[PDB]
Amino acid sequence: MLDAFSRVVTNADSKAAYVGGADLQALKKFISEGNKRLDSVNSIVSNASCIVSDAVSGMICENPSLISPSGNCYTNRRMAACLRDGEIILRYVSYALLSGDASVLEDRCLNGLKETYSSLGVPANSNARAVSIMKACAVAFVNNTASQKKLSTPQGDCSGLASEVGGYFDKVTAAIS
Amino acid sequence: DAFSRVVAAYVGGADLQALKKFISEGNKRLDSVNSIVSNASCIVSDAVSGMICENPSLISPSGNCYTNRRMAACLRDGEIILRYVSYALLSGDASVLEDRCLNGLKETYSSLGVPANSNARAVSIMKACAVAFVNNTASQKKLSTPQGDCSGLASEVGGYFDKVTAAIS
Amino acid sequence: AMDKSAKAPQITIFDHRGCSRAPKESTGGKAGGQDDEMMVKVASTKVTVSESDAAKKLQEFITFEKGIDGPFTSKN
Amino acid sequence: AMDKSAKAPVITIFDHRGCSRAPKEYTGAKAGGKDDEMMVKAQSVKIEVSTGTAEGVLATSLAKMTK
Numbered sequence: 001m002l003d004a005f006s007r008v009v010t011n012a013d014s015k016a017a018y019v020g021g022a023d024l025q026a027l028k029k030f031i032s033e034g035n036k037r038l039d040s041v042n043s044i045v046s047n048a049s050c051i052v053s054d055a056v057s058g059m060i061c062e063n064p065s066l067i068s069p070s071g072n073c074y075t076n077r078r079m080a081a082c083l084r085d086g087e088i089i090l091r092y093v094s095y096a097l098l099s100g101d102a103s104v105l106e107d108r109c110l111n112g113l114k115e116t117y118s119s120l121g122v123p124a125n126s127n128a129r130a131v132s133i134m135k136a137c138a139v140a141f142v143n144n145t146a147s148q149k150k151l152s153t154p155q156g157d158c159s160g161l162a163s164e165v166g167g168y169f170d171k172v173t174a175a176i177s
Numbered sequence: 178d179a180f181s182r183v184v185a186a187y188v189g190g191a192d193l194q195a196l197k198k199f200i201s202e203g204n205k206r207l208d209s210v211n212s213i214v215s216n217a218s219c220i221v222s223d224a225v226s227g228m229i230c231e232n233p234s235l236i237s238p239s240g241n242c243y244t245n246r247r248m249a250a251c252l253r254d255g256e257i258i259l260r261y262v263s264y265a266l267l268s269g270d271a272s273v274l275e276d277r278c279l280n281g282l283k284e285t286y287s288s289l290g291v292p293a294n295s296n297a298r299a300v301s302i303m304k305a306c307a308v309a310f311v312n313n314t315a316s317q318k319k320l321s322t323p324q325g326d327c328s329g330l331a332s333e334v335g336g337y338f339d340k341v342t343a344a345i346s
Numbered sequence: 347a348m349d350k351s352a353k354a355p356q357i358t359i360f361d362h363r364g365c366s367r368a369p370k371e372s373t374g375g376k377a378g379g380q381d382d383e384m385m386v387k388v389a390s391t392k393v394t395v396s397e398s399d400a401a402k403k404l405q406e407f408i409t410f411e412k413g414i415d416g417p418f419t420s421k422n
Numbered sequence: 423a424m425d426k427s428a429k430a431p432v433i434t435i436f437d438h439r440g441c442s443r444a445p446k447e448y449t450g451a452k453a454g455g456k457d458d459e460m461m462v463k464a465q466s467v468k469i470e471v472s473t474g475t476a477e478g479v480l481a482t483s484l485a486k487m488t489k
């Protein structure tokens with residue numbers, strides 16, 4: 001558990017929580033791979049709008065009926081809700097990657113989610129493709145093998161963290177598919 | 178004439194056949210336009226983000242993107258500029274770009290205090306984006322375009338960005 | 347002259363050859379070929395960005411990360 | 423459980439080593455090194471998406487789809 005974020009993760013208040021200085025020094029030895037882990041989270045959440053929009057637009061170009069008049073992304077209201085869900089899921093995955101634990105993702109995002117989507121008729125095959133595109137985006141940002149000049153971080157091998165974040169997306173896929 | 182009146186016009190079928198007779202390289206040109214327009218959100222975001230990461234004082238309390246109101250206007254302006262450049266490439270002409278976007282724009286930005294070196298950098302990052310999309314060498318690619326050379330169209334769109342740069346720098 | 351309205355050309359390119367949604371918006375008849383399943387739409391629309399959306403973008407921008415393309419040029 | 427609030431943990435990773443804007447928000451103990459110039463922020467925020475964003479994704483999807 002990240003104790004400073006206990007009220008964040010239970011939605012107990014809307015107050016920001018801050019971990020810097022000696023609290024951050026200790027956080028990076030509590031979690032593993034601390035500097036690379038925080039870099040990995042940064043590269044995903046700083047690109048969140050594009051990851052979600054590309055994933056939803058990709059889900060739709062593979063299955064255009066989603067924005068036909070009978071499709072579950074038809075109208076600005078439904079499209080906004082779908083984009084919003086994509087971001088909610090991405091952000092819970094980013095918190096699993098920050099903390100190195102899937103528990104908050106499982107407990108506060110996935111538990112009961114499939115039953116909600118079943119009640120509403122939110123198409124699970126399409127939802128699974130949105131999640132798999134978001135997964136592919138996150139893995140490419142974390143395990144980015146371009147040259148040093150194109151990277152924001154000191155070059156090194158982050159394939160381990162890419163596999164780890166991949167497994168959190170797989171927990172989403174198993175829960176909602 | 179239809180697009181002129183507008184600038185909705187819905188040009189398909191025989192009207193589209195006619196449209197591609199009066200613009201050079203019509204099929205390639207519409208591929209080039211779509212490669213920019215369909216990716217416009219990432220182009221504007223990457224250009225404003227890159228402007229700011231090269232000069233973070235733009236979002237300090239004295240910077241011209243400080244406050245959500247100013248940032249919104251800046252993101253908007255990036256999109257407006259990219260739309261007029263895209264329409265120049267669609268039409269094969271700079272006249273609407275010059276008349277409706279650029280004429281008077283520097284005077285407006287000078288009165289407002291919108292920083293011209295920062296603005297020039299946002300435009301230059303959008304230019305690099307658009308060149309790569311036209312040539313299909315951006316990181317996100319279109320899969321199934323007939324292979325051929327669009328370096329003439331990439332040069333042409335580069336020239337529209339350069340008109341923007343010249344007008345505002 | 348730049349007229350300060352924030353309106354700009356909004357282009358949509360539909361290369362919808364083979365699309366099962368039938369075309370119904372063209373006005374000049376048929377080419378008798380694949381132009382009949384494709385369209386360029388141009389509108390003149392005001393460009394607007396909400397303040398809440400700008401706040402979302404600032405929360406991304408302020409950490410000085412980038413996309414896959416381009417050199418990293420930040421010094422922060 | 424998923425509580426239907428549309429809230430999520432918004433994480434902001436501030437690695438601002440070398441930054442002239444002084445740290446102030448974090449008031450805990452100092453590390454005495456580069457960790458004093460870096461911070462993880464997290465906040466429970468209701469996630470919202472605008473009509474403009476939804477319209478932009480719709481336009482992208484129409485332009486990128488084919489059949």
Ligand SMILES: *C(=C)C1=C(C)C(=O)N/C1=C\c1[nH]c(/C=C2\N=C(C[C@H]3NC(=O)C(C=C)=C3C)C(C)=C2CCC(=O)O)c(CCC(=O)O)c1C
Pocket residue numbers: 064065066067068069187188189190358360362364365366367368369370371372381382383384385387484487488489
């Ligand atoms: C094929 C791709 C699709 C499948 C499969 C599906 O279920 N929907 C598909 C496409 C689709 N098209 C629209 C809307 C529009 N398409 C056009 C362009 C076509 N109209 C024409 O007249 C011609 C050529 C002569 C075309 C090509 C336009 C103008 C619209 C209206 C929307 C607009 O942006 O102006 C949709 C949206 C839902 C709908 O209207 O059916 C979808 C998903």
Ligand SMILES: *C(=C)C1=C(C)C(=O)N/C1=C\c1[nH]c(/C=C2\N=C(C[C@H]3NC(=O)C(C=C)=C3C)C(C)=C2CCC(=O)O)c(CCC(=O)O)c1C
Pocket residue numbers: 020021233234235236237238408422434436437438440441442443444445446447448449457458459460461463
């Ligand atoms: C350096 C990069 C910058 C230059 C140059 C400049 O002009 N502004 C720069 C940075 C800058 N930071 C903020 C805002 C915040 N920074 C933090 C994180 C730091 N606070 C700390 O306590 C520590 C470490 C112990 C940090 C690192 C926080 C939390 C904020 C507040 C905003 C937030 O999003 O929560 C800005 C924004 C304008 C300002 O407040 O100065 C900028 C541009």
Ligand SMILES: *C(=C)C1=C(C)[C@@H](Cc2[nH]c(/C=C3N=C(/C=C4\NC(=O)[C@H](C)[C@H]4[C@@H](*)C)C(C)=C\3CCC(=O)O)c(CCC(=O)O)c2C)NC1=O
Pocket residue numbers: 047050051054055057058059061062132133136137138140141219316317412413414415486487
């Ligand atoms: C419809 C024609 C259609 C799409 C829309 C598109 C969707 C799609 N996108 C990927 C993969 C990636 N997208 C990425 C996103 C981004 N990169 C950036 O630099 C910006 C900030 C951000 C927004 C555009 C990334 C990083 C990837 C992964 C790398 C790669 O390109 O694959 C996929 C592939 C998903 C898969 O691997 O399963 C798809 C489907 N494709 C379309 O067909």
Ligand SMILES: *C(=C)C1=C(C)[C@@H](Cc2[nH]c(/C=C3N=C(/C=C4\NC(=O)[C@H](C)[C@H]4[C@@H](*)C)C(C)=C\3CCC(=O)O)c(CCC(=O)O)c2C)NC1=O
Pocket residue numbers: 216219220223224226227228230231301302305306307309310314315316317318410411412413414415416417418419420
């Ligand atoms: C701040 C840390 C920071 C940035 C932000 C970044 C800015 C930057 N971007 C480029 C160049 C390009 N960006 C592109 C954008 C996109 N490609 C895609 O696939 C997605 C959809 C979209 C959004 C991310 C592209 C296509 C390019 C050109 C790539 C190429 O030529 O192949 C640059 C270079 C600008 C220059 O050449 O003048 C910069 C600096 N860098 C940062 O440090």
Ligand SMILES: *[C@@H](C)[C@H]1/C(=C/C2=NC(=C\c3[nH]c(C[C@H]4NC(=O)C(C=C)=C4C)c(C)c3CCC(=O)O)/C(CCC(=O)O)=C2C)NC(=O)[C@@H]1C
Pocket residue numbers: 024028034035036037038039040042141142143144151153154155156157158161435436437456460461462
């Ligand atoms: C995969 C994730 C990346 C990659 C990452 C690397 N980062 C390295 C070092 C490093 N990163 C940070 C910043 C980090 N620590 C924090 O405390 C915070 C925020 C609170 C962040 C964002 C630091 C301070 C360091 C160490 C100092 C330095 O070297 O600058 C790193 C090199 C060290 C190591 O291998 O452990 C790597 C490889 N590298 C990549 O190529 C992929 C894309």
Ligand SMILES: *[C@@H](C)[C@H]1/C(=C/C2=NC(=C\c3[nH]c(C[C@H]4NC(=O)C(C=C)=C4C)c(C)c3CCC(=O)O)/C(CCC(=O)O)=C2C)NC(=O)[C@@H]1C
Pocket residue numbers: 193202203204205206207208209211311312313322323324325326327330359360361384385386
């Ligand atoms: C640079 C832009 C690209 C490149 C482009 C090429 N496109 C070619 C042909 C082609 N493109 C389309 C689609 C286009 N026409 C339309 O009317 C609309 C939408 C309204 C669009 C999006 C068509 C119909 C065709 C003709 C071939 C076909 O039947 O598919 C093309 C071939 C040469 C030519 O036709 O001039 C090229 C070279 N190719 C590249 O490699 C760069 C990246």
Ligand SMILES: *[C@H](C)[C@H]1/C(=C/C2=NC(=C\c3[nH]c(C[C@H]4NC(=O)C(C=C)=C4C)c(C)c3CCC(=O)O)/C(CCC(=O)O)=C2C)NC(=O)[C@@H]1C
Pocket residue numbers: 225235241242247248250251252254255257258277278282285289291292295296299348349350351352353354
């Ligand atoms: C972003 C890359 C810039 C930035 C831009 C700002 N622009 C601001 C205001 C503004 N911009 C325009 C021109 C715009 N309106 C049009 O109708 C057309 C073209 C047809 C364009 C290109 C106008 C007329 C105005 C003032 C009126 C308005 O706000 O709508 C602006 C707001 C400044 C202020 O309120 O303080 C900003 C921040 N700022 C930057 O730092 C980068 C370089």
Ligand SMILES: *[C@H](C)[C@H]1/C(=C/C2=NC(=C\c3[nH]c(C[C@H]4NC(=O)C(C=C)=C4C)c(C)c3CCC(=O)O)/C(CCC(=O)O)=C2C)NC(=O)[C@@H]1C
Pocket residue numbers: 056066072073077078079081082083085086088089108109113116120122123124126127130424425426427428429
């Ligand atoms: C996008 C990839 C999908 C898609 C999404 C839809 N979701 C809609 C509604 C909906 N989603 C949730 C789950 C969300 N709220 C939470 O609090 C959390 C986690 C903590 C999550 C992940 C709920 C509770 C609801 C119903 C209540 C609500 O909307 O606030 C939705 C319907 C929206 C509407 O009609 O208003 C859609 C369209 N749809 C797709 O086609 C793809 C697969």
Ligand SMILES: [Cl-]
Pocket residue numbers: 316317414415
């Ligand atoms: Cl990419």
Ligand SMILES: [Mg+2]
Pocket residue numbers: 103106
């Ligand atoms: Mg458990």
Ligand SMILES: [Mg+2]
Pocket residue numbers: 152409410411422437
């Ligand atoms: Mg950094």
